[PDB]
């Protein structure tokens, strides 16, 4: 049987799928994530602040 990928298939997004939230997913915290500090963030935290010292 043809072992190759099949061109001639619908390349468009499919507007026929459950559009609702899926209540069947692991609801628990995920113990498989980088636990380190992540050195990839803006070190200049100054574009947005409350001009009033108090809120």
């Amino acid at each position: 049987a043809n072992p190759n990928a099949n061109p001639n298939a619908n390349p468009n997004a499919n507007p026929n799928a459950n559009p609702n939230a899926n209540p069947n997913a692991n609801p628990n915290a995920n113990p498989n994530a980088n636990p380190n500090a992540n050195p990839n963030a803006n070190p200049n935290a100054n574009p947005n602040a409350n001009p009033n010292a108090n809120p």
Epitope: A37, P39, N40, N42, P43, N44, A45, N46
Partner: antibody
Framework: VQLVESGGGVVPPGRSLRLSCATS????????MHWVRQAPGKGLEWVAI????????FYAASVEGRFTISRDNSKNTLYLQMNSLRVEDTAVYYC??????????????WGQGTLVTVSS | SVLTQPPSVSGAPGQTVTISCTGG?????????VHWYQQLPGTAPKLLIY???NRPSGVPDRFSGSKSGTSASLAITGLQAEDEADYYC????????????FGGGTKLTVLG
């Protein structure tokens, strides 16, 4: 914006050297800083970053634990204290002003650097 | 060397030359923005390109950038004698502890 560097020179291996990047033309206290280095004849290597308020610091793996980065915001000055210098640390060190775009950061102004030589 | 750059590029003044930089799924194809710096023989690198395509107002409109998958790019049109320089790419490698990673640089020689 202007960054000025001083502190290079020849130091016997094992000894320390301090670099100092004097700055002006911007509010030093509102920006983080970087150091990079370039050994003669080599390309660029990132060395360290310090957050605008000193709340977070990161080091290249090859220098972590030997180098200390700090800021004296009141003097508009960035420092790099290198202890236990090795011959392999010979390089022009440069300071740069941290900048950030979207998914990654960058430098948007560079100092001129100074040459640190470690030699017997 | 984290990002891969060819060691050399050249052409005559008036010609178009390009400088490439290829990464992997951890640094360029990873969605991290690629930046470019130009270093002249007696000084520090200068920001040439940022955000893959943009550039400082201090850069002549002779330079521009791009990106496709893991391949980043710098194009120089209207090559001048004054473009002799070391061109470096920069990105962020999610597998490493450093804020910035660099390629080894490409040496541009203008055949003047």
């Amino acid at each position: 914006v202007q960054l000025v560097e001083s502190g290079g020179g020849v130091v016997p291996p094992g000894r320390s050297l301090r670099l100092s990047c004097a700055t002006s033309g911007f509010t030093f206290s509102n920006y983080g800083m970087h150091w990079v280095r370039q050994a003669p004849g080599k390309g660029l290597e990132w060395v360290a970053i310090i957050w605008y308020d000193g709340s977070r610091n990161f080091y290249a793996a090859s220098v972590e634990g030997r180098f200390t980065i700090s800021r004296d915001n009141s003097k508009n000055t960035l420092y790099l204290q290198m202890n236990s210098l090795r011959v392999e640390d010979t390089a022009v060190y440069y300071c740069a002003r941290a900048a950030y775009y979207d998914t990654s950061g960058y430098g948007d102004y560079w100092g001129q650097g100074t040459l640190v030589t470690v030699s017997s | 060397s984290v990002l891969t750059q060819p060691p050399s590029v050249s052409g005559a003044p008036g010609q178009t030359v390009t400088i490439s930089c290829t990464g992997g799924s951890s640094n360029i194809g990873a969605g991290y923005d690629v930046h470019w710096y130009q270093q002249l023989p007696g000084t520090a690198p200068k920001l040439l390109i940022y955000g893959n395509i943009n550039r400082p107002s201090g850069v002549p409109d002779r330079f521009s950038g791009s990106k496709s998958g893991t391949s980043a790019s710098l194009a120089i049109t209207g090559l001048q004698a004054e473009d002799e320089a070391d061109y470096y790419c920069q990105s962020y490698d999610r597998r490493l502890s450093g804020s910035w990673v660099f390629g080894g640089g490409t040496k541009l020689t203008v055949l003047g």
